[PDB]
Structures are given as C-alpha cells and as structure tokens.
Design a protein around this ligand. Sequence first.
Ligand SMILES: NCc1ccccc1
Ligand SMILES: NCc1ccccc1
Ligand SMILES: [Ca+2]
Length: 223
Amino acid sequence: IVGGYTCGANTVPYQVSLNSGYHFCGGSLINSQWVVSAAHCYKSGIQVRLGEDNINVVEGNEQFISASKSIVHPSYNSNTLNNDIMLIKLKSAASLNSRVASISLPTSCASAGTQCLISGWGNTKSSGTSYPDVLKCLKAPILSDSSCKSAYPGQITSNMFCAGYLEGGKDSCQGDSGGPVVCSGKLQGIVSWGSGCAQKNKPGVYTKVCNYVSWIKQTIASN
Ligand SMILES: NCc1ccccc1
Ligand SMILES: NCc1ccccc1
Ligand SMILES: [Ca+2]
C-alpha cells in the first residue's frame, strides 16, 4: 500500500497473509474455513496466516493453518485477469474472536464514489521498494466505469472496477494482491492489477466480488 496508514493491530480481522515460506499475497476470511483471494495468487503449499499485524514477529494472536485445497475460478484468464478470484479452504476451522473474524459477502454491488478500505503488507513505494512489517490501510473511492475504462482502454471487463486516485500517490501495490477492498462493511473487491503503483492516471483495478457470490456459495456448499 502506497500513501496509506498503519491500520492498527487486528483492526482488519478478516485480513489474511498467504505464506509459502514468505508472505506473497493477501486474502480475506469469509467464514471459519474459507479465504477469498486472487486467482493470480494461486500456488501449491499455501499456509494461511490469520490474526497478523507484524508478519515478521509472532505477537500472540496468530493462527497459522495450512490450506487443504484451492479452487481457481473456472473462467479465470491469467492474460486479461478476467475473473481474478480464488477460494482457499483451511485444513481446520479458524477460531473466530475479535482479532480473527470473517467479512460478509455483498448483497449488491458497490456504488461509484463509495469510499472503501484496502489493506495489505505490499510495497509502500511508487518508485522503488520498501516492504512494511505491519499491516497498512488505504481509504480509496470507487471510480466511475467511464474513468476506469479511460485509464485502461480495452482492458476493463464487467468483472473489474477501479478505485483510488487519478492524481497518483495512493494505491495498492505488489504484495497486496489478493487482499480485500471493503466497502460499507462488505467484501466488494480483491486487489488484482494495475500499471505500477500510485502512478498518475493508473488507478488500481479490483475483482468485482458481487459478481461471484453465487459461485462462492455454490462452491463452499460442495467442497
Ligand atoms: N483497443 C483498446 C483501446 C481503445 C482506445 C485506446 C487504446 C486502446
Ligand atoms: N496498483 C495496483 C496494483 C496492485 C497489485 C499488484 C499490482 C498493481
Ligand atoms: Ca505476527
């Protein structure tokens, strides 16, 4: 997260870190057994880390639980990033309390202009590289479809929305991928792609979770 703020420990209790020997992506806990992340975060051997603030220090509220299975969206296209969503099942249920909690799926799609909360352990620099230890947060509005399309001509599908700041300075970045965009208390987006971080006229692009609720519910009912 570039241009954001320190969230505060366990103030984003649905935020997970995906670890394969190192942090590589975020995710969102949607019930005691399931995480939603980006399909471009897929890999084998995932350990889900819940209850994290500093990802480099064991502070006392963590739960580390291995994934038993991952399910990439059946129509994910890694070229276009259309349908950039994945479900990850935990080998054992998480214990839910104030420091670890699920986030609700949306009922309706979020509105242009709505401020949302984006979070992650990704790079904090637009130019160059610096990774934080503690979870970072960013308040960012959803942009109009027309401004999103103008920023990325020919690339925005109905399964994507833009959020952030056309002037630059404030955005998600590498290592935030797969993490949450929460608007009005519901999971509306997944950190998906863009062109760099915090560059002018290149806002972040987010998977539009409201399009996927049916697939999520059906999948978790059978796996
Ligand atoms: N083919 C998409 C596109 C449209 C206008 C400008 C650039 C790219
Ligand atoms: N600046 C949007 C973005 C997020 C994740 C990875 C690449 C780019
Ligand atoms: Ca920790």
